């Protein structure tokens, strides 16, 4: 799970992106 990918993904939706192990999650 890369962190600056992973919040990307959840800065579009418009939350903050953590990355548990390899999976990428919004909160």
């Given at each position: ?14 939350l903050?992106?953590?990355c ?8």
């Amino acid at each position: 799970c890369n962190l600056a990918r992973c919040q990307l993904s959840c800065k579009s939706l418009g939350l903050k992106g953590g990355c548990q192990g390899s999976f990428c999650t919004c909160g």
